[PDB]
């Protein structure tokens, strides 16, 4: 009876080597450190190890510092979201607890299971998740010093790291795309007309977004900001709550988000309204503070109109609705479009978990080339796994055709590409 | 200095060998004494995690990888800007470690570095750097190291058995192996009863013979250790070239240092046996064309292949032709083969068929329990053409099998 | 000829003073606040032989104590920098050497080469050095003389 221990978040810390230049103030480098109950000397030792790793890799490539450090027991992922500000995530290696001849628990560390891209993307997502709600590190610094920066870091990451689950992280976490909601042109035009009507009648509403069935439909924001906003809406905001029009966020306190950080650095109150699953997000300038009567005014104006629209999508979606032997993950980089027939709502994998490592390694080998590419593989578990990278689209197909040759696999892949991607 | 440092940083694979105390032992590019501080940093990084009940494996950065392997009393570091994974780079570093062992014996290495850890291993390894550079170049271009298998020189079955019998007839008590070599290719191997030859020792012997020209001046008698066979003892290899104009290298491994006249006999005896039977003309003819073209197979859109037999531990491959005429293209093709082999031979995720369709080439890998076959096609080749190539090449290898492989390995 | 030299003391991190004004200023590799050691290179010309010093200027913080057994292995000699403005001179000079001999554990700790560099009474340190098997004492210029004597010793033992 072997025991399997999945990867776990060993530690997470944000530091700045420029702080505390003189001896005895190394503790000032560590802006945030989790777990907090770890001893101070151990904290300084871990931060110093990461600084040493980056400074050593800078002797072979000054422009490109280290992104990862692999050890026997854990893997540590580095990121520098802002100059001199380093985040580090230490993730425990998977463990096999073998029963030896006289029991003798043997703790084997499976050092090759973890996919580096998954946790690197997770770390980048941690930074962007912080920056969506609290802005950049430098802005908080110029506002209120290292003290204010540390309070903001703690207040966000103490509650953010509780919701991080590194056992369920997979290729979809590398992708970081948006699961879009397919639609026809008439309903798209209706959505645009509705969004214009409400954002013009309400005046102060300066940004908008429309999602249905947890899937994004239309986005008035910027791509790299709407990405993180959609992650917040789907994986954090909706699950806590999972005419019929109802306020989902607000009453009057509205979360303050920061978008277009690289260009304009706009702070907006975030408002979310639900009719069925037709989520509408309004974003209002920070100068205007909404009142109880404004949302009451807002409720009346949106009200049945979203409810009328909501009852319209469900009928058309049901009307549009043999078994597809293909199970694929598709990612488009132009629009960050993401589709998946493998992962369902548990979201964790619905296939044999030994094939996700294959799917992650095909992705690992893909990015070394910026051209058309194709890798077709057959596992020892008689499963066919294909991957195609063409004109900034990535397709990963898995098929159960144990009695099939290469020609039949290619024919099935071509049929899928012609049908599901017409 | 600024330009020299910038050129030093741009090398595709730095290899550092250092003691557990930090003192340099070897650097592929640049002097060891100018890199002493960086090797001290390497030891400090190793020890920092060793004192944390951990062990540092590798550091991955965009575009390159640092790989640490600790084979006490040595730390071997590889800073590679290539595609090779950490496992393949660790395998190359282990090949370097076994190359050092082949010169020093593990017993002597551990003893000298446990009596004192302030010792400078460069003192014992002085003059043996060029062996390490030659071994690294062979990894860069020879498919044998990636395959972990020997290549057989294509030779007629009658001639191959004649030369094998001639090798067997010339034997001594102390001999363990009898190897006939042609440009890092096997011609005839005669081994002792129940004394297998690991591929790693054979590759180390390839590198040893191909690193120096002193073996071409006559008879050689040097102590060499076979780390995968017996890491605590020294063998003694008699290395000779049969004729001055040929590339035939005869290696006779023995357990006795004093026995040199006997091994020189067993060399002369085999030479005159070969001359008496008249097979030396056929061997010279085979040496004049020591490779075969892809066009012999007859399937178009094929450029190169590797075929290893799991049962025999031997592989065959045609001559590397256009477009891989240059060294860069040969290295790229070998790197593609390395990628295919590593992916298909994952410890936890093994695979049995890989088909890669890149803009520059098509790559195929078929790995079963009996053989592994790696194929290269032009990018214009289709999938059905690839399968037909599989079947035609299988038929052709099963037809030329006697000529391309040693099918009946002899024994004293 | 490459030597591994450990400098005990010098809480300077970046401004090590002695290990910044010694020689070269290239091959810096400053990790005395992250690893606990400074890795420097210094060529020394002694008796028709040119030796190289892989100097390990180790940090003296308390979070780097567990790294002594590792960082001190293979060391050929150790250099002590001793403050002349301390009240515990005789009780803290011996502690450094005792802990070094415990952690490094050379083959002949009794005859291990040591050198004391007075930084910033001389009688006390000189008497301690004489009572410690005649350890050379230099007052710190004078950072060059110690390393040549450091080169002079530890070559006599092995070579």
Residue numbers in the entry:
A (entry chain A): 16 to 257, 278 to 286, 296 to 365, 372 to 396, 401 to 476
B (entry chain B): 241 to 652
C (entry chain C): 7 to 126, 135 to 154, 160 to 178
Sentences from the paper on this structure:
The functionally conserved MON1−CCZ1 (MC1) complex serves as a guanine nucleotide exchange factor (GEF) for the RAB GTPase RAB7A and is indispensable for directing RAB7A recruitment to autophagosome or lysosomal membranes. Among RAB family members, RAB7A serves as a master regulator of late endosomal maturation, lysosomal biogenesis, and autophagosome−lysosome fusion. The spatiotemporal activation of RAB GTPases is precisely controlled by guanine nucleotide exchange factors (GEFs) that catalyze GDP−GTP exchange, and GTPase-activating proteins (GAPs) that accelerate GTP hydrolysis. In metazoans, the MON1−CCZ1 (MC1) complexes have evolved through the incorporation of an additional non-tri-longin domain (non-TLD) subunit, RMC1 (Regulator of MON1−CCZ1) in humans and Bulli in Drosophila, suggesting functional specialization in higher eukaryotes.
To address these knowledge gaps, we present the high-resolution cryo-EM structure of the human MON1A−CCZ1−RAB7AN125I (HsMCR7N125I) complex at 2.85 Å resolution, capturing RAB7A in a nucleotide-free state stabilized through unprecedented interactions with CCZ1. Due to the RAB7AN125I (the nucleotide-free mutant) exhibiting poor solubility when expressed alone, we co-expressed HsRAB7AN125I with HsMC1 in Sf9 insect cells via dual baculovirus infection, enabling efficient complex assembly. The final structure demonstrated that HsMC1 adopts a heterodimeric architecture, with MON1A and CCZ1 each comprising three tandem LDs (LD1−LD3). Inter-subunit interactions within HsMC1 are mediated by β-sheet fusion between LD1 and LD3 domains of MON1A and CCZ1, forming two continuous β-sheets that stabilize the heterodimer. High-resolution density maps resolved key residues at the HsMC1−RAB7A interfaces, involving RAB7A’s nucleotide-sensitive regions: the Switch I (N30−D44), Switch II (A65−G80), and the P-loop (G15−T22). MON1A engages RAB7A through polar contacts between its E260/E290 side chains and RAB7A R79, as well as K263 and RAB7A D82. CCZ1 contributes complementary interactions via hydrogen bonds between E41/R60 and RAB7A R69, Q70 and RAB7A Q36, and E38 and RAB7A Q67/S17. Comparative analysis of GTP-bound and HsMC1-bound RAB7A revealed large-scale rearrangements in nucleotide-sensitive regions: Switch I (19.7 Å), Switch II (6.3 Å), and P-loop (10.7 Å). Our data support a two-step nucleotide displacement model: MON1A-mediated Switch I restructure weakens GDP binding, while CCZ1-driven P-loop rearrangement disrupts Mg2+ coordination, enabling passive nucleotide exchange.
